[PDB]
Each structure stands twice: as structure tokens, then as C-alpha cells.
Design an enzyme around this catalytic site. Sequence first.
Site, PDB file in Angstrom:
ATOM      1  NE  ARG A 205       2.950   6.953   4.963  1.00 15.87           N
ATOM      2  CZ  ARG A 205       2.441   5.883   5.528  1.00 15.87           C
ATOM      3  NH1 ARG A 205       2.937   4.674   5.260  1.00 15.87           N
ATOM      4  NH2 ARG A 205       1.362   6.032   6.301  1.00 15.87           N
TER       5      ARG A 205
ATOM      6  CG  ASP B  77      -3.524  -1.653   7.233  1.00 15.26           C
ATOM      7  OD1 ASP B  77      -2.425  -1.218   6.868  1.00 15.26           O
ATOM      8  OD2 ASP B  77      -3.709  -2.285   8.295  1.00 15.26           O
ATOM      9  CB  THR B  78      -1.338  -4.139   2.139  1.00 14.65           C
ATOM     10  OG1 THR B  78      -0.388  -3.067   2.213  1.00 14.65           O
ATOM     11  CG2 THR B  78      -2.180  -3.898   0.902  1.00 14.65           C
TER      12      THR B  78
ATOM     13  CG  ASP C 139      -0.349  -0.078   2.533  1.00 10.94           C
ATOM     14  OD1 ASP C 139       0.870   0.286   2.597  1.00 10.94           O
ATOM     15  OD2 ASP C 139      -1.039  -0.395   3.546  1.00 10.94           O
TER      16      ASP C 139
ATOM     17  NE  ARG D  59      -0.638   3.130   4.384  1.00 10.19           N
ATOM     18  CZ  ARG D  59      -1.844   2.586   4.376  1.00 10.19           C
ATOM     19  NH1 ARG D  59      -2.647   2.670   3.310  1.00 10.19           N
ATOM     20  NH2 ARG D  59      -2.273   1.929   5.485  1.00 10.19           N
TER      21      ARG D  59
ATOM     22  CD  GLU E 174       3.514  -2.707   7.586  1.00 11.06           C
ATOM     23  OE1 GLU E 174       4.593  -2.420   6.998  1.00 11.06           O
ATOM     24  OE2 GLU E 174       2.501  -1.943   7.599  1.00 11.06           O
TER      25      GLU E 174
HETATM   26  C1  LIG Z   1      -3.927   5.638   5.026  1.00 12.89           C
HETATM   27  C2  LIG Z   1      -3.631   6.715   6.077  1.00 12.89           C
HETATM   28  C3  LIG Z   1      -2.660   6.519   7.030  1.00 12.89           C
HETATM   29  N1  LIG Z   1      -2.384   7.492   7.944  1.00 12.89           N
HETATM   30  C4  LIG Z   1      -1.451   7.286   9.076  1.00 12.89           C
HETATM   31  C5  LIG Z   1      -2.248   6.661  10.225  1.00 12.89           C
HETATM   32  C6  LIG Z   1      -1.255   5.674  10.825  1.00 12.89           C
HETATM   33  O1  LIG Z   1      -0.496   6.303  11.892  1.00 12.89           O
HETATM   34  P1  LIG Z   1       0.462   5.476  12.864  1.00 12.89           P
HETATM   35  O2  LIG Z   1       1.760   5.366  12.069  1.00 12.89           O
HETATM   36  O3  LIG Z   1       0.651   6.449  14.014  1.00 12.89           O
HETATM   37  O4  LIG Z   1      -0.084   4.173  13.194  1.00 12.89           O
HETATM   38  C7  LIG Z   1      -0.306   5.309   9.683  1.00 12.89           C
HETATM   39  C8  LIG Z   1      -0.626   3.911   9.171  1.00 12.89           C
HETATM   40  O5  LIG Z   1       0.117   3.711   7.947  1.00 12.89           O
HETATM   41  P2  LIG Z   1       0.734   2.299   7.600  1.00 12.89           P
HETATM   42  O6  LIG Z   1      -0.428   1.357   7.564  1.00 12.89           O
HETATM   43  O7  LIG Z   1       1.409   2.561   6.295  1.00 12.89           O
HETATM   44  O8  LIG Z   1       1.660   1.930   8.742  1.00 12.89           O
HETATM   45  O9  LIG Z   1      -0.521   6.281   8.705  1.00 12.89           O
HETATM   46  C9  LIG Z   1      -3.049   8.712   7.847  1.00 12.89           C
HETATM   47  O10 LIG Z   1      -2.796   9.565   8.741  1.00 12.89           O
HETATM   48  N2  LIG Z   1      -3.955   8.966   6.903  1.00 12.89           N
HETATM   49  C10 LIG Z   1      -4.306   8.029   5.985  1.00 12.89           C
HETATM   50  O11 LIG Z   1      -5.206   8.268   5.176  1.00 12.89           O
HETATM   51 CA   LIG Z   2       0.105  -1.374   5.989  1.00 11.86          CA
END
Ligand SMILES: Cc1cn([C@H]2C[C@H](OP(=O)(O)O)[C@@H](COP(=O)(O)O)O2)c(=O)[nH]c1=O
Ligand SMILES: [Ca+2]
Length: 129
Positions: A75, A34-35, A15, A29, A37
Site C-alpha cells: 500500500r 488509525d480508523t 483510512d 493507507r 475497521e
Molecule cells: C499506517 C502504517 C501502517 N503500516 C502497517 C503496520 C501494520 O502492520 P500489521 O498489519 O502487521 O498489524 C498495518 C496496520 O494497517 P491497518 O491499520 O490498515 O490494518 O500496516 C506501516 O507499516 N506503516 C504505516 O505507516
Molecule cells: Ca485501521
Amino acid sequence: LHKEPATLIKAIDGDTVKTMYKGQPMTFRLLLVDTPEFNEKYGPEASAFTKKMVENAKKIEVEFDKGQRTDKYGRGLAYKYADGKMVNEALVRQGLAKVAYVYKGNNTHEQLLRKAEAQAKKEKLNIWS
Ligand SMILES: Cc1cn([C@H]2C[C@H](OP(=O)(O)O)[C@@H](COP(=O)(O)O)O2)c(=O)[nH]c1=O
Ligand SMILES: [Ca+2]
């Protein structure tokens, strides 16, 4: 919403993808998904699905939603398209991503993705197996 051009720089994982957008490298992103890891069950299969889909495309496009266009990590947050097919939806339809991270105002394609997820669940695909 509207599609804008981008060109693949590098597949990263299920993702996230690095693409050039308005001439600048960024890591995107994918909205609303959510894929796993890479180290988790199906993580490698999600990574390879997205990689195939973006690497084989003749045309990548990005579509921002109405809300925040970057996250706290810098991102980009967008829907990504490969030869017109939404990567975010395709992952969900194959049971390789869950619908997740649905924030108010950046959720234009939520219901489209939830319908894909229901179908992947019915078929018991991958994550849902
Ligand atoms: C998809 C997405 C992720 N995020 C943030 C929330 C999550 O914070 P935390 O890192 O504090 O958990 C993180 C999850 O991304 P990943 O799933 O790539 O780890 O990215 C956003 O803020 N907005 C979004 O639309
Ligand atoms: Ca992920």
C-alpha cells in the site's frame, strides 16, 4: 514535502483509498492515523467520512513523507488532500481516527495531527465520547 496529483478510483474505508497516481492504480493507507475497521464502533462513520471527503473533492492530491512510500502490503503511505484539506487531519479532528503508527522519518505532520486529536478529545467527539 510537496503535493502531487492523483485521481480517486474508489473509497475503501476510513483510512484506505484507491487512487490513480502517476497513471497507476494504488491503494493508499493514510499516514499517522488509525480508523476503526468497518466492523468496529465508528468504523462505518469513518468510512463514510473519508468517502464523502474524497468523492466530493474536485482535486485529490497525495503527499509523500521523507521515508518509506509503501508498506509491507504494497500500500502507498501518504497524506491525502481533498480540495487542499488534509484527509488524515480531518479524520483526527473529528474523533474518527486516532494518531497512530508514528514511525521515525515518516512523521512530518505528527504534531499537527496530535493538536487535532487534543481538540477532538476536548470536544469529546465520536471515539472520545
Ligand atoms: C499506517 C502504517 C501502517 N503500516 C502497517 C503496520 C501494520 O502492520 P500489521 O498489519 O502487521 O498489524 C498495518 C496496520 O494497517 P491497518 O491499520 O490498515 O490494518 O500496516 C506501516 O507499516 N506503516 C504505516 O505507516
Ligand atoms: Ca485501521
